[PDB]
Structure 1
Amino acid sequence: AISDADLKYLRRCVDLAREALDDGDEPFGSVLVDHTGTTLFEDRNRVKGDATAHPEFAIARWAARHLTPDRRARATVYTSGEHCPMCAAAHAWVGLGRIVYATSSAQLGGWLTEWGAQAPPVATLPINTVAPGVVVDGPAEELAETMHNLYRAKFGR
């Protein structure tokens, strides 16, 4: 179950990943959405400061800065690509709720290997390995090609 509504948000994350790519950054987009449906915060990759400038992390801090603990747990975080261990840990520490992702990090690491790309210094661990009690849906089969192409644009070799 990835709902027709979820898809709407994952597509938006993909738009944001595109946006990041066009500005010279890595293609990752993420979106914070309250239990109501109102979209509270949108972000994308900004590595062109530290290599840690991931949207999913920036949401985690925004979630702590402006929401109450009860709100956070009722929120959902959509993302173009599955949270990396930094981002999943952060999500769990601030006690955010659901995660939905369009491609897995399994998908991504496979494709990097295909392109002979530098295997990242952080392991492509599933979210549930890092944050065991988070509810996780993903990946989305409809967006797999789209993301494969997006990732290729930045990591193909």
Structure 2
Amino acid sequence: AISDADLKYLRRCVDLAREALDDGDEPFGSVLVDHTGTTLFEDRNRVKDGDATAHPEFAIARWAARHLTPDRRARATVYTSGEHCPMCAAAHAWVGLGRIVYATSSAQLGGWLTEWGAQAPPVATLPINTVAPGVVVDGPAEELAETMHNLYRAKFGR
């Protein structure tokens, strides 16, 4: 299963996804943590002003390219409530970030959308390693499945 320390940062990601929903946005949150265990950057979706590319994982990738050396990026971890879409997985790989840990997979998300009769996203729900074959990926976290099911249903399952 997932480490206890990893699960604590995933719970922070879920809290960020809840912040996003409560601000009229989509429930996706992500945290960048360095190899010392220091949180460097936290973000959530910001698509409500009209830019559907406003994903936290992408913001993290550009922040890392700006602020961190290649060595430091490679040793950092990105935690996310939901597995990176292909945009974000590719951006992560381009900048040379390290491990990804997700609470819920894109397989879970896509399966729930179809359960609810909801439209699929306009991007295929490709696993990270289809897009970015070298990235170390862990998840999902069983303890957080129900919570994320309920967040996603609130936004996308009406």
Hey, what's the Cα distance between the residues in 1 that align with 2:141 and 2:24?
Answer: 25
Cα deviations by residue, 1:98-153 (Å, 9 ceiling, x for unpaired)? 00000000000000011111111100000000000000000000000000001011
Q: Aligned pairs, how many?
A: 157
Alignment correspondent of 1:134 = 135
SS of 1:121's partner is coil
Deviation at 1:54, TM superposition (A): 0.1
SS of 1:30's partner is strand
For the aligned residues, what is the CA RMSD? 0.6
Deviation at 1:61, TM superposition (A): 0.1
Hey, what's the Cα distance between the residues in 2 that align with 1:51 and 1:81?
Answer: 16
Instruction: For structure 1, list consecutive stretches of 5 or more residues without a partner in the other structure.
Output: none
Cα deviations by residue, 1:19-68 (Å, 9 ceiling, x for unpaired)? 00000000000000000000000000000141000000000000001000
SS of 1:129's partner is helix
Hey, what's the Cα distance between the residues in 2 that align with 1:121 and 1:81?
Answer: 16
- Identity across aligned pairs (percent)? 100
Detail structure 1 runs of 4+ shifted over 6 Å in the superposition.
none
Cα deviations by residue, 1:59-105 (Å, 9 ceiling, x for unpaired)? 00000010000000000000000000000000000000000000000
Give TM-score, length-normalised by structure 1: 0.99
Moved more, 96-105 or 112-121: 112-121
Hey, what's the Cα distance between the residues in 2 that align with 1:58 and 1:151?
Answer: 21
Hey, what's the Cα distance between the residues in 2 that align with 1:70 and 1:119?
Answer: 37
Pairwise mapping of residues 5-154 of structure 1 onto structure 2 (< 5 A)? 5-48=5-48, 49-154=50-155
Hey, what's the Cα distance between the residues in 2 that align with 1:2 and 1:114?
Answer: 26
